[PDB]
């Protein structure tokens, strides 16, 4: 006597006119002329943008920082559009098109002689950002498979998450910070400059609290 259980009903969810992911251009419409600094702080530390769900229920969460170029968008789009159910699923981009210019010098050139020429564009992504958001008349199990495939092919650590798994992920981290039996935490020591520890820490380590090392995110650190 199997115990049947009710199934969720998808009468409160409408599908956009264009459920598929739009096309992302290689370079912006009007090309940039001013070359920009390296500015590596834009993939360092936690994301302060696109960190919450807006329309859909599932997404790819970035578990690290990195740069998305056009080849990544092509991989994300074709894999998602080919694997989604257009009638019952929609997908929105949560990252902008490549806008940061990247310069390269001619092959075989020596150091010096001015900065190189703009080569391509990228999009900086910080850890904790949603990259693509999906929703519709589906469960997480239906999308988790191919969202994990696209996430595994991203230039940073990423993972397919749900409206619910994202929240438990955050509850578990806060639970660990509370039941941590270690009297010594990175934050406490680094904020009080205990042991004169700031001679080996970055100023950024006062807010990263040992959870970030460059572009890498460490979810085990409390």
């Amino acid at each position: 006597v199997k115990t049947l259980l009710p199934v969720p009903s998808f009468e409160d969810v409408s599908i956009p006119e264009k459920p598929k992911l739009r096309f992302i251009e290689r370079a912006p419409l009007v090309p940039k002329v001013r070359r920009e600094p390296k500015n590596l702080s834009d993939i360092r530390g936690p994301s302060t943008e696109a960190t919450e769900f807006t329309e859909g229920n599932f997404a790819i969460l970035a578990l690290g920082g990195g740069y998305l170029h056009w080849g990544h968008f092509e991989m994300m789009r074709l894999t998602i559009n080919r694997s989604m159910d257009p009638k019952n699923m929609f997908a929105i981009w949560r990252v902008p098109a490549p806008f940061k210019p990247i310069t390269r010098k001619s092959v075989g050139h020596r150091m010096g002689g001015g900065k190189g020429a703009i080569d391509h564009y990228v999009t900086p992504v910080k850890a904790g950002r949603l990259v693509v958001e999906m929703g519709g008349r589906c469960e997480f199990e239906e999308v988790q498979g191919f969202l994990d495939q696209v996430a595994h092919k991203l230039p940073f650590a990423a993972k397919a998450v749900s409206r619910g798994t994202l929240e438990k992920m955050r509850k578990d981290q806060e639970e660990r910070e509370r039941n941590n039996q270690n009297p010594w935490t990175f934050e406490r020591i680094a904020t009080a400059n205990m042991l004169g520890i700031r001679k080996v820490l970055s100023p950024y380590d006062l807010t990263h609290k040992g959870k970030y090392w460059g572009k890498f995110y460490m979810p085990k650190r409390v």
Binding site: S106, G113, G114, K115
Partner: peptide
């Protein structure tokens, strides 16, 4: 071995005004 280019930005050599 390879012929190199040149920077196109001149000026910008004034020191601080204090």
């Amino acid at each position: 071995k390879k012929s190199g280019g040149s920077s196109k930005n001149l000026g910008g050599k004034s020191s601080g005004r204090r």
